[PDB]
């Protein structure tokens, strides 16, 4: 099982123009036996996890980007490494888009 789970698409920068992945993905958070967090985006079509990511608590922040009109989107900072990922849901309602990246933010950060 998953402490959240969401559906969400990644992004992708092609040189100097910003272009969204068509591909349709699932965000989810999973704790091993070990204590650990790891934050995952699979592939809804495949099914295969292409992103494993390990995050310790504070490690990273979740944020909204306001810089896109559309406030759907998501940007995960990475403080060791600057490191940016951005996602945007794919729910059809945005009333329950925000309380998704509130409980990810609560998990990652505690
Ligand atoms: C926000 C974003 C903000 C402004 C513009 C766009 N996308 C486009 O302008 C655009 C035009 C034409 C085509 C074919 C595709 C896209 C996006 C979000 C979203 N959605 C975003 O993807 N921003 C983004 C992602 C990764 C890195 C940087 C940025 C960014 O906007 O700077």
Redesign the pocket.
Same mark, same amino acid.
């Given at each position: 099982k998953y402490l959240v789970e969401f559906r969400a698409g990644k992004? @992708?920068?092609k040189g100097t %123009?910003? %272009? !969204?992945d068509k591909r349709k993905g699932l965000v989810y958070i999973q704790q091993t036996d070990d204590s650990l967090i790891h934050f995952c985006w699979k592939d809804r079509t495949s099914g295969n996890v292409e992103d494993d990511l390990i995050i310790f608590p504070d490690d990273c922040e979740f944020k909204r +980007?306001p810089?896109? !009109? @559309?406030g759907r +989107?998501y940007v995960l900072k990475f403080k060791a490494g600057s490191k940016?990922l951005?996602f945007?849901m794919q729910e059809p309602k945005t009333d329950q888009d925000e309380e998704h990246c509130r409980k990810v933010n609560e998990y990652l950060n505690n």
């Open positions: 992004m @992708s920068l %123009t910003v %272009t !969204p +980007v810089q896109c !009109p @559309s +989107v940016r951005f945007w």
